[PDB]
Amino acid sequence: LSINERITKELAEVEERERIEKQLLLEAERINEIDTLAKAHLSNHFNKEVLLAKGYTLKDIMQAQRRELVRKFVPIEQIKAIAKVSDISHIDGEILEQLVSLAKVNIKLRK
Amino acid sequence: VEERERIEKQLLLEAERINEIDTLAKAHLSNHFNKEVLLAKGYTLKDIMQAQRRELVRKFVPIEQIKAIAKVSDISHIDGEILEQLVSLAKVNIKLR
Amino acid sequence: LSINERITKELAEVEERERIEKQLLLEAERINEIDTLAKAHLSNHFNKEVLLAKGYTLKDIMQAQRRELVRKFVPIEQIKAIAKVSDISHIDGEILEQLVSLAKVNIKLRK
Amino acid sequence: VEERERIEKQLLLEAERINEIDTLAKAHLSNHFNKEVLLAKGYTLKDIMQAQRRELVRKFVPIEQIKAIAKVSDISHIDGEILEQLVSLAKVNIKLR
Structure with a gap:
């Protein structure tokens, strides 16, 4: 292990x-955005407190809020296009991020 | 075999996709992007197909959809499954149009 | 491997x-013709969307459209002559291509 | 994995803890202790968070609770489980406020 190796290891660690x-x-920032979206566009029954009381993981809460926002703002045909299927119950992931970006677009143009 | x-x-x-895109694009976008004239300008089959897809997205799919779903405003380099999603979204927009 | 071998291999690949x-x-071109023929000469119930919803392969859709077009345009005597049998349910292939060419000729002379 | x-x-x-602390601190203490200005002044994220926690204690928790529970009047060096206790006491104080 030489000086250059030491420097490159230190830089890689940093x-x-x-x-x-x-x-x-x-x-x-993702948690803050989910909180704001849930407070602004979705019902109080889908709050983090009540969902946690019902016993759901935080990621499950985020994806449920995202799916509800997509159904509320993004229409069924666009859903069937981007996700290639009507149902969103098994589309959590990068496609879900794309769909919720579409939902943000829809609310921005709605305002 | x-x-x-x-x-x-x-x-x-x-x-199927090759001809369908051509058939709808001729009636939707313009005659300047016809396959014959594009071949004359020197565009390969795949390049014509993807360019027509991108023009369909630029016509039907709105720019905020482009910069949010596809994460980039420019469809110039987004080709792939994201482009498939965008062209399906354009099919939706023309269906509801 | 010499340069002549390199050139012939490159040319063969290209x-x-x-x-x-x-x-x-x-x-x-084949699929374009299938779509146009289905739209122009055959009923809406044989559309690719509803056939795919019923769960048929694309090749099955194309051959079903071709068979329906042959029955609609080509006479039964011509079918029994060219295809050697009345039933077209097992005549998909080059004979089917000849039959649909005859159907195209039939519609051209009908117009 | x-x-x-x-x-x-x-x-x-x-x-989430950092976000909650920042959201309440912005509305309670001042804008001078904002994350952006503190980062510009050159404090690490953890240093910013602990400084904000100590300011929250100095605002809500009365000084006697500090000099007895934490055993020192100065919150400058009490960080740890005692700091967690102090910030929970500050949460209680703001709840009753």
Whole structure:
């Protein structure tokens, strides 16, 4: 292990920790966005407190809020296009992120 | 030989999309993007197909849908399953139109 | 492997891919004709959407449309002569291509 | 990969805690302690969070609770489970306020 190896290992470690921190900030922003969307566009029965009392994981809460927002704003034909199917119960993921971006678009144009 | 038979079936399957896009694009976008003139300008079959798909997206699918679903405003480099989603969305927009 | 072998291999590969492209063009014309014939001469119940909903392969849709067109246009005597049998349920193929060519001629002379 | 999944679960937990602390601190203390301006002044994220927690304690928790529960009047070096106790006391105080 030479000086250049030491420097490159240190730089790689620092960059890895920085990337982890950026991921933390991204997750915090995602949680904030989900909270705002649930408060603004969805009913109080879908609140994080009541869902947790019913016993659902936080990721399950986020995806349920996203699916409800997609059904509320994004119409069924666009759903059938982007997700290639009508049902959203098994489309959580990158396609779900795309659909909720479409829902944000729909609410922006609705206002 | 059944491998080549399934290859020919795949040819039919993609061929369907090839002609359908042309048929709807001729009536929706313009005559400037006709396959013959595009070939004359020197565009391969796949390039014509993807360019017509992108023009269909730019006509039906709105720009906010482009920059949010596809994560980029420019459809110039989004080709793939995202492009499939966008062209399906354009089919929806023309269906409801 | 010498340079002449390199050139002949490269040319063979390029020609194979060009043949693939020619197949694409021809087959696209085939499907275009199938769609136009189904829209113009056959009922809405035989549409590709409803057939796919009923769960039939694309090749099955094309051959069903071709058989219906042959029965609609080509006379039964011509079917019994060219295809050697009255039933078309097992005549999909090159004989079916000849039958649909005869049907195209029939509609052209009908107009 | 479930080890990384649980790591990400803890990451979500601390991110939500940070978000809640920031949201209440912005409306309670001042705009001078905003995350952007603190980062510009050159404080790490954890340092920003602990400074905001200490300011929350200094705002809601009365000084005697600090000099007895934390055994020191200065919250400058009490960080830890005692700091968690103090910020929970601050939450109680703002709830009753």
